Design a binder for this molecule. Structure first.
Ligand SMILES: Fc1ccc2nc(Nc3nc(-c4ccccn4)cs3)sc2c1
Ligand SMILES: Fc1ccc2nc(Nc3nc(-c4ccccn4)cs3)sc2c1
Lengths: 193, 193
């Protein structure tokens, strides 16, 4: 039952490490999962639904890790606070580079993927803005830009920059440098002027 | 001759304001340009080549405007310097929102579009880094991050944020706010700490 579903998911994530979703057949996923093609369709309506599920698991993994941090403030300076949070996305998505790259591509063709990404980005931006607001209330950050607009640009920067690094795009920040790069821009723009 | 080509280009840009390239036929472009379908193929091998040409014109328009600024330093403070430069992209791409949105989508399917965008992004990042380097040399900016890595993240932020605003994505910064938002992040991250 659920074993077969997890096997389909594992096959898909493994095959996506070597070629795009368009070059992966339903027969490919069935074979790698040890089932027939009609048995596959019992668990998933299409290979695109498999990717949707894989991406849903990754985004919820990142969201739950961020929720854990928010309930467990690490005892450090403000710079380290932001780094620990950005690192949740660096580590979670960087551990699922194939699903991440495939999910970004599917945003152009799948309404559910686009809506899934949009829902979680709105959640993460709202949390970023709430923390900026708290920092302003306690006197640690200046009241410069509207906090939600700042949070939006910083989160969109992280999306584009992290995914360019993971995919090895040209241009991109080297993966070994991208965390320091983003943290610097977040901290100077949140606390500067 | 060139009149027919410009007519095809104008028809394509007009039709892209209402539906994606996948929903525009070669017959659509021929009809709107007042020519036959075989005559169309004399000027362009495909509708994708039409988009490639449209995007090439827009990116070169932005590049030439930025080159004009670089040769004509406006007499203002450092903040205004950066704003005037970011504004080149805000105005150029914001005046061609349909071609911009279609070109971004084609990056996933067209090697020439992806290489075109990558070439000009590398050029614009190198220029950004050169200006940051000049500001550090004259003593106006601190030596914090590697300038080219900072420039990469700031330019990728601008790409993602401007295009989200133009497309009305959720989430996005309102178009009337995106210039102030980006300028703040550039100036604080280039001159801060
Ligand atoms: F402490 C905090 C509180 C909020 C907070 N928000 C963050 N930014 C985000 N990055 C992404 C993202 C997107 C695509 C790929 C990788 N990452 C989505 S939202 S980092 C952080 C740290
Ligand atoms: F003075 C200067 C010197 C360099 C400089 N570079 C800039 N950034 C760029 N933005 C984009 C972009 C991409 C996609 C959509 C819109 N814009 C490409 S490169 S703004 C600026 C101002």
């Amino acid at each position: 039952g659920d074993d077969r579903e997890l096997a389909i998911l594992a096959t898909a994530e493994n095959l996506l490490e070597d070629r795009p979703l368009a070059d992966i057949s339903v027969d490919d996923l069935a074979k790698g999962a040890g089932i027939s093609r009609p048995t596959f369709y019992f668990y998933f309506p299409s290979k695109e639904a498999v990717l949707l599920t894989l991406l849903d698991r990754v985004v919820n993994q990142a969201d739950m890790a961020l929720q854990t941090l928010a309930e467990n403030p690490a005892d450090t300076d403000r710079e380290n606070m932001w780094r620990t949070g950005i690192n949740v996305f660096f580590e979670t998505f960087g551990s699922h580079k194939a699903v991440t790259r495939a999910g970004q591509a599917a945003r152009a063709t799948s309404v559910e993927v686009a809506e899934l990404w949009s829902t979680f980005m709105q959640k993460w931006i709202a949390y970023t803005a709430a923390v900026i607001d708290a920092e302003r209330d306690r006197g640690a950050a200046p009241r410069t830009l509207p906090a939600h607009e700042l949070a939006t640009a910083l989160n969109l920067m992280n999306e584009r920059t992290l995914f360019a690094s993971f995919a090895g795009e040209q241009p991109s920040v080297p993966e070994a440098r991208v965390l320091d790069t983003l943290v610097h821009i977040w901290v100077t723009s949140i606390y500067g002027e």
